[PDB]
Paper text:
BadA catalyzes the conversion of benzoate to benzoyl-CoA in the metabolism of aromatic carboxylic acids. Its catalytic mechanism is shown as follows: benzoate firstly docks to the active site, where it orientates to allow the carboxylic group access to adenosine triphosphate (ATP) for the formation of an adenosine monophosphate (AMP) intermediate; coenzyme A (CoA) subsequently comes in to substitute the AMP-activated intermediate resulting in the formation of benzoyl-CoA. The solved structures show that the benzoate binding cavity is rather small and narrow, constituted by several bulky amino acid residues including Y228, G327, S328, T329, H333, and I334. With the purpose to allow acceptance of various bulkier substrates into the active site, a double mutant H333A and I334A was created.
The capability and capacity of the engineered benzoate-CoA ligase are manifested by crystal structures in complex with a 2-chloro-1,3-thiazole-5-carboxyl-AMP or 2-methlthiazole-5-carboxyl-AMP intermediate. As revealed from the determined complexes, there are considerable hydrophobic contacts between substrates and the polypeptide backbone of the BadA active site. In AMP binding site, Lys427 plays an important role in coordination with the carboxylate group of the ligand by its positive charge and in stabilization with the AMP group during the thioesterification. Several residues in the AMP binding site, including Arg421, Thr329, Ser328, Gly303, Asp406, Asp324, Asp325, with polar contacts with the AMP-linked intermediate together stabilize the intermediate for subsequent thioesterification to proceed. The crystal structures of the BadA mutant (H333A/I334A) in complex with two different intermediates validated the objectivity and rationality of this modification. Three protein crystal structures in an apo form and in complex with a 2-methylthiazole-5-carboxyl-AMP or 2-choloro-1,3-thiazole-5-carboxyl-AMP intermediate validated the engineering rationality and synthetic practicality of the modified enzyme. To further explore/expand the substrate promiscuity of P. sylvestris STS, five different thaizole CoA derivatives 4-methylthiazole-5-carboxyl-CoA, 2-methylthiazole-5-carboxyl-CoA, 2-chloro-1,3-thiazole-5-carboxyl-CoA, 2-bromothiazole-4-methyl-5-carboxyl-CoA (2Br4M5C-CoA), 2-bromothiazole-5-methyl-4-carboxyl-CoA (2Br5M4C-CoA) were enzymatically synthesized using the engineered BadA, which were then subjected to biochemical examination.
Author numbering:
A (entry chain B), B (entry chain A): 6 to 523
Write the structure that this text describes.
């Protein structure tokens, strides 16, 4: 892959590479569609519009939007102007977005109407710098200083040229949560999604122009941002977007061509979603779908899930591992080389190192801390020098995963190095769940650990000590949590115990809980 | 009043004042009591303990504690060591405390056991610098590294001298919220509580050594901090503290001598609480109580509440207005000079100005913006230069209130200049409540305004536009907000309307809602 030139604007790059296919559908969703030419026009008009409201090069805007045709316009339009979009999870709380507004110093927000209430709450509680709110598909009357996204785009002529950005200039942020502390602002350059889209989207997945890409992982996920934006635009594929929650029924409807007159040829999702789909009694037969490639990320793919999918569809699930920090997969199975129970082989262009506690090599078959050297690494966590130095050093990026290298060069996930859980491809801190449970007045202590279901898919499991003189229901706690945290941050099962296992120091013996002693 | 010396440590000042009365009870609560000697001992041992864990002079510690004998130990012990306690409301959310931890850079937390769960959540989610959590009266097992307050204090010899602070050095912070944005860190000096305790506590209220002080307003409120700590310690009075919520029954029990063998002689609280007590069927008779002085603040005292109290008890309610920024009252009725319907006269030592639209004087009988010039003003809002400039300008502190000066020199409250409400005498932002309501899926729009109830007390009133195509009941809306807002923020009434009055920009015409137009 040829490196991007020193002067490089990733949005310009994606627009330019599709000037040969102006009338092909770039993006289609439930209610709208954009050809590549329409996408380019709206992108450059939004770029002009953002500059007109005074957002300057390198300033941030918050992109808080459901998947839909407006999303790539917002993302690329900002980048084309040299403005840094901060693309965020749409399922978070007002508290979460309040922090993101403050930390990013976002000068404007591009928000879906359905998310306007939580954004409004975040704006009211925060010390933000937001000058304008741009509402895509408003679901309530606009407030002062808010503008409809279509009107905002429609009111400005296209910017003539992209900002004169450098390949190594920041292009966009994603936020990544760790086990404690605030979410980290992961800074990606213009070059980074070029490298992922070439090394992985084109050269590993072999995406091509006639594909129809459809990702259950939303665009704000590093995974989905490649799957359903940077990858397909790099090759001219058509992308199906879906705003609603990706349930088996919702995915099946898209697979069967229920939207846009298109049948996806390439699907991406999390192992949990594949398992839920394989269990569904209305699972389509392979004769009904156009799938040629099934991609997985976000959590390890149990061999039994992939084997069952392959038996039913005659397609493998191609499991790869990426991270927010590396932007896309650095270890992956190949479309025609799948070893279930492993994450496959280094993606060409990425170097992988496993390190033991001494920082030295580890023997094959022994677990080591996974480090990645690749051209798509984020530059830093914005405003967190300490965590940046711990994660990014000397061209190597520390994943916080443990991995085993097998005899055939494949890599098998061996767990985390920080108790983070990955439920449905989204990071979940067990400590955040625990601290919310203990706020319930009937809870004395609580411990949340990751426990595999029969499938080998890790889910949060709560061990709760009730307070004497109170009785607790499991649903009572789930509700209590949903009233405070994002809606997916709840234990999948809860066991009430008289006492938690602890060391002499009072430290909870989480391994005993995981291992099932109680 | 003689100014404090330039070398001045307020905690040492209060300890020194009471060395003449070592065996008198300083503080007593449901389960404990501290003589002035015991208080000084425990204060100086806590000061040494904080220094021993590395907290340095001028660093902050978060003081998140229910009222109880440990509270003045934590507060004065920090101050004695030259460490800045940040005394905060105990009814806030984990997100509020997470912000306060980061914003204050608190190096330790002193927390009541009952509040450890919300603190734990705040620690887990924030980028804090807390080195140690000290738990007063733990309600659940200590976590590794945490220490019990009693052990923490008991494990360290008393510091031999206080930090050699100056009178105008920061001594402590309180947090105060405005209609939007984060709570503001109000910075008070060592001199400020000297000025309030001398000018108001001693010279206006005439508190004296044989008083027993009891404040419904908690110690973290500027009002309560004077009422139940700086004022009584200044004169050697005994103070009754109560951890639980101040219901009429809870207050009556202590008025009647149910705790510590003492009957309060001085009571302080909000007009809302006085109204609640006057409505209580077991309102004590004046022969049953030892009250000689009843103070109110927080919201305007409706004349009928004062008059009914005076008719029942033969005792007036002495209404004074203070603020977090001014620390205590700057306009007040006097123990023997009460004009109901007014906040009385300037507190000697404080200069009052009413300013019009251009900053000039306003003619008597006309409302103006209230500005205060007095020696207890906070110096700034920490880390917010913009809001500091708008509030503190050249010796004058802008209250955010409007007032009318009467012919007899008294001052009659004329509302706020900023949409904030004082419900139950506590700051409530209508915008917070609105932003909570619109996150309910059946709510399209919401407007919250203050309306005076049957007793003349302002309560929030919600006007809600339901979302078309959704079912929404007043009961389900009450359930929705019950576990999302503190009770004092609950709208006392919700009206479902078809539309809200707006300007063309979408601004809600809240004045029309206050005028009953809907
Ligand atoms: N395939 C696979 N196996 C095992 N663990 C995996 C995995 N994919 C992802 N993880 C875990 O998730 C962490 C990275 O999370 P992000 O939420 O930081 O990155 C996303 O998962 C992405 C997945 N694909 C992309 Cl392309 S980006 C990782 O460290 C693993 O712990
Ligand atoms: N007595 C009285 N009448 C009318 N309004 C009053 C009032 N006291 C207080 N207010 C309002 O409350 C604002 C200040 O609120 P605060 O939480 O910063 O401080 C407290 O209310 C204090 C009250 N007494 C103390 Cl001593 S500290 C004020 O601006 C008024 O709007």
């Amino acid at each position: 892959v040829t490196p991007p030139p020193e002067k490089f604007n990733f949005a310009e790059h994606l627009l330019q590479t599709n000037r040969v296919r102006p009338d092909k559908t770039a993006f289609v969703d439930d209610i709208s569609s954009l050809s590549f030419a329409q996408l380019e026009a709206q992108t450059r008009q939004l770029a002009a519009a953002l500059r007109a409201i005074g957002v300057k090069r390198e300033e941030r805007v918050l992109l808080l939007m459901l998947d839909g045709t407006d999303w790539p316009v917002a993302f690329l339009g900002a980048i084309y102007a040299g403005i840094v979009p901060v693309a965020v999870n749409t399922l978070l709380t007002a508290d979460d977005y309040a922090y993101m507004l403050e930390h990013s110093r976002a000068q404007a927000v591009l928000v879906s109407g359905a998310l306007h209430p939580v954004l409004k709450a975040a704006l009211t509680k925060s010390d933000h710098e937001v000058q304008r709110v741009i509402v895509s598909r408003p679901a309530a009357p606009l407030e002062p200083g808010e503008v409809d996204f279509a009107e905002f785009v429609g009111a400005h002529a296209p910017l003539e040229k992209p900002a004169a950005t450098q390949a190594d200039d920041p292009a966009f942020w994603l936020y990544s949560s760790g086990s404690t502390g605030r979410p980290k602002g992961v800074v990606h350059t213009h070059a980074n999604p070029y490298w992922t889209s070439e090394l992985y989207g084109r050269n590993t997945l072999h995406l091509r122009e006639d594909d129809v890409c459809f990702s259950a992982a939303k665009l704000f996920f590093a995974y989905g941002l490649g799957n359903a934006l940077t990858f397909p635009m790099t090759v001219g594929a058509t992308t199906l977007l879906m705003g609603e929650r990706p349930t088996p029924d919702a995915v099946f409807k898209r697979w069967l061509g229920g939207v846009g007159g298109v049948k996806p040829t390439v699907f991406y999702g999390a192992p949990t979603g594949y398992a839920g789909m394989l269990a569904a009694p209305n699972l389509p037969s392979r004769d009904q779908v156009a799938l040629r490639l099934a991609s997985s990320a976000g959590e390890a793919l149990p061999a039994e899930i992939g084997q069952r999918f392959q038996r039913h569809f005659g397609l493998d699930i191609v499991d790869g591992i990426g991270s927010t920090e590396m932007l896309a997969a650095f270890l992956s199975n190949l479309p025609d080389r799948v070893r279930y129970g492993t994450t496959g082989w280094p993606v060409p262009g990425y170097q992988i190192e496993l390190r033991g506690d001494g920082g030295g090599p580890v023997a094959d078959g022994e677990p080591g801390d996974l480090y990645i050297h690749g051209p798509s690494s984020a530059t830093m966590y914005w405003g967190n020098r300490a965590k940046s130095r711990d994660t990014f050093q000397g061209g190597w990026t520390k994943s916080g995963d443990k991995y085993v290298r097998n005899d055939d060069g494949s890599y098998t996930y061996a767990g985390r190095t920080d108790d983070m859980l990955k439920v449905s491809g989204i990071y979940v801190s067990p400590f955040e769940i625990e601290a919310t449970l203990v706020q319930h007045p009937g809870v004395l202590e609580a411990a949340v650990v990751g426990v595999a279901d029969e499938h080998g898919l890790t889910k949060p499991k709560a061990y709760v000590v009730p307070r004497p003189g109170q009785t607790l229901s499991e649903t009572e706690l789930k509700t209590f949590i949903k009233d405070r945290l994002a809606p997916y941050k709840y234990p999948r099962s809860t066991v009430f115990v008289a006492e938690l296992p602890k060391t002499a120091t009072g430290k909870i013996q989480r391994f005993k809980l995981r291992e099932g002693v109680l």
